[PDB]
Amino acid sequence: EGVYRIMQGKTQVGVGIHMEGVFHTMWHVTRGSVICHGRLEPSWADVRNDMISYGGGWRLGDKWDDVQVLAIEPGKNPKHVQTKPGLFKTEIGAVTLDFKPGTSGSPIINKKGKVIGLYGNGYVSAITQAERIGEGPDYEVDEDIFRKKRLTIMDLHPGAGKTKRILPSIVREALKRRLRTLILAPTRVVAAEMEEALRGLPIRYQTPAVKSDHTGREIVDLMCHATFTTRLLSSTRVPNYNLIVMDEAHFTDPCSVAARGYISTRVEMGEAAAIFMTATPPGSTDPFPQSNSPIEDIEREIPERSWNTGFDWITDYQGKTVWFVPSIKAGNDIANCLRKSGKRVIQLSRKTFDTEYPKTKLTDWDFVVTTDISEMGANFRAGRVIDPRRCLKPVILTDGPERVILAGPIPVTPASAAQRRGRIGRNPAQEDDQYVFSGDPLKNDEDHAHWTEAKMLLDNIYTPEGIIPTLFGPEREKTQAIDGEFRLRGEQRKTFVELMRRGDLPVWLSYKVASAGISYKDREWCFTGERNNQILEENMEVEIWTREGEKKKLRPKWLDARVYADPMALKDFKEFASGRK
Amino acid sequence: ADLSLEKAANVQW
Ligand SMILES: [Cl-]
Numbered sequence: 001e002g003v004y005r006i007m008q009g010k011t012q013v014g015v016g017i018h019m020e021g022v023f024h025t026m027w028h029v030t031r032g033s034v035i036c037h038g039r040l041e042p043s044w045a046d047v048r049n050d051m052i053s054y055g056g057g058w059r060l061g062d063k064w065d066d067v068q069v070l071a072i073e074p075g076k077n078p079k080h081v082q083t084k085p086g087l088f089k090t091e092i093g094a095v096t097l098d099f100k101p102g103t104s105g106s107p108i109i110n111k112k113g114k115v116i117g118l119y120g121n122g123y124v125s126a127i128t129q130a131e132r133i134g135e136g137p138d139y140e141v142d143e144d145i146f147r148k149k150r151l152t153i154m155d156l157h158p159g160a161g162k163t164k165r166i167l168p169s170i171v172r173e174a175l176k177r178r179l180r181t182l183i184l185a186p187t188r189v190v191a192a193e194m195e196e197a198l199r200g201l202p203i204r205y206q207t208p209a210v211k212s213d214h215t216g217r218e219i220v221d222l223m224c225h226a227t228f229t230t231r232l233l234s235s236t237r238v239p240n241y242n243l244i245v246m247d248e249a250h251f252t253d254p255c256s257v258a259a260r261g262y263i264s265t266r267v268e269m270g271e272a273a274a275i276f277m278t279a280t281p282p283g284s285t286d287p288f289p290q291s292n293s294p295i296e297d298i299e300r301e302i303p304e305r306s307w308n309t310g311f312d313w314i315t316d317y318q319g320k321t322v323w324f325v326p327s328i329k330a331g332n333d334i335a336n337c338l339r340k341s342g343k344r345v346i347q348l349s350r351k352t353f354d355t356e357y358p359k360t361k362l363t364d365w366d367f368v369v370t371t372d373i374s375e376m377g378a379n380f381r382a383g384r385v386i387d388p389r390r391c392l393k394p395v396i397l398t399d400g401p402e403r404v405i406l407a408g409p410i411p412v413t414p415a416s417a418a419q420r421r422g423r424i425g426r427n428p429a430q431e432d433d434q435y436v437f438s439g440d441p442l443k444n445d446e447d448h449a450h451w452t453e454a455k456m457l458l459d460n461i462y463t464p465e466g467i468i469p470t471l472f473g474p475e476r477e478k479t480q481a482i483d484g485e486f487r488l489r490g491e492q493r494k495t496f497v498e499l500m501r502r503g504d505l506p507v508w509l510s511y512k513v514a515s516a517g518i519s520y521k522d523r524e525w526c527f528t529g530e531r532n533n534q535i536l537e538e539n540m541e542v543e544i545w546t547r548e549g550e551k552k553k554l555r556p557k558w559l560d561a562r563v564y565a566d567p568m569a570l571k572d573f574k575e576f577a578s579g580r581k
Numbered sequence: 582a583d584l585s586l587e588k589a590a591n592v593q594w
């Protein structure tokens with residue numbers, strides 16, 4: 001609504017224009033900072049040309065070619081100053097007008113009432129502006145995205161809004177339309193951030209520990225992907241949501257894949273509408289998508305273990321980095337190494353995420369060493385990503401006696417790499433953020449255990465219609481499994497759910513045990529394995545003291561790596577093997 | 582607080 005002085009003992013630094021909802025000013029003035037009124041979001045900036053935008057993209061009336069410079073002097077007053085701009089070659093026009101420092105950002109007017117540039121300081125003072133722009137202010141316009149038997153993908157991107165303006169917008173619209181709305185976060189921490197963004201709506205958070213909750217007053221349910229699925233498995237009460245919204249819909253975690261399959265089935269039913277939010281839709285394969293601010297891509301050899309020299313660019317870099325590693329174990333290596341150098345590093349994995357992410361948001365740090373979990377929603381105030389584009393993938397060895405092993409380090413998918421790189425280049429920075437990476441990604445992940453683990457979840461979810469639910473379209477071509485064969489009747493089914501819910505066991509594992517007719521309470525299968533099935537912890541053969549009072553070596557019948565592939569999961573499987581769980 | 586605003590004028594002829 002007009003023209004403001006950028007005030008910062010501390011006085012006026014520059015001038016900005018607020019037009020059509022967006023705030024415009026020179027780059028040198030804010031130097032990248034935020035402004036206050038509450039806060040003002042720095043969204044866009046052409047750095048070299050010297051200018052920044054707040055709350056969206058630039059707005060223009062025309063260009064030059066007879067003009068006034070409404071100069072807002074510091075400790076002075078607005079005075080309309082009219083002049084003809086020079087025709088200097090460089091094609092940039094400019095005025096011969098010298099106003100004192102702090103004036104930078106003043107509106108230049110072609111004789112109507114529409115701004116055709118900004119006064120740039122500074123031999124002569126340019127009419128600073130670029131090509132036609134731009135995107136759109138922090139208000140959202142939507143369809144038509146609520147009709148039954150419809151599915152929509154929003155590939156949201158860190159501008160205005162995102163988790164900021166888009167989600168509350170559709171929720172406001174949904175409530176206005178009396179739709180029982182469900183929202184799905186990948187992680188508690190992302191759901192928590194949803195709550196602040198929604199503060200003021202009837203939004204109830206829903207624990208996994210509760211199998212269903214119902215009020216019959218207009219409410220909006222907020223849960224983790226896995227909460228949904230486990231409720232779909234254990235609750236008898238199909239709640240008939242008509243709008244389902246999935247934030248970060250690219251999560252290939254089986255509870256996610258499952259959720260997506262069920263949801264897609266409700267849509268085809270005619271029963272639901274669905275919205276899937278993600279920058280990398282399942283089936284997408286660009287590892288270099290567009291981004292809100294410029295990213296410098298840098299292809300360079302990166303340490304996979306400790307190092308002592310020739311990697312100066314690492315330690316020399318004067319800011320916060322994100323480093324994706326293929327594993328907790330690899331991460332210790334790198335952290336251990338970084339710490340030699342006197343670097344504040346925070347480590348993240350699935351298990352530790354909920355208690356260790358907030359440390360990144362709330363304290364002075366130098367490095368994050370993260371597994372791929374940070375591909376789901378993770379938000380960082382960092383400048384550089386270091387991404388060796390590697391990972392471990394669980395595979396069911398079909399080659400004789402079945403087992404799950406952590407294969408790799410193998411290279412990541414294009415999508416996974418897009419997401420890792422997608423940590424960076426959200427906020428305008430003085431230097432373009434840096435994506436430092438190594439190797440090409442690989443797209444064939446069809447032997448990934450998660451696909452069949454999903455079908456295991458999926459075809460054990462029962463619908464009143466009697467339809468077996470199935471994988472979301474683009475994800476169907478990832479198994480040759482036939483719909484329904486993993487279905488498990490009787491209380492083999494109930495066991496299969498319990499082991500997952502209370503036993504904390506992976507899907508595949510949970511499956512093999514239930515379908516053998518083993519009762520949850522029974523734990524002998526943890527000890528009746530073949531010699532080559534012996535678990536080891538830090539290089540010693542694991543022994544555990546039973547609830548009936550015996551020492552036996554940890555040797556399960558069916559071997560699934562994910563129980564023994566990081567102390568925290570292994571601490572757990574030990575408690576299960578006891579009978580504490 | 583680090584920087585704020587103050588409405589000075591409006592866009593005119
Ligand atoms: Cl992990």
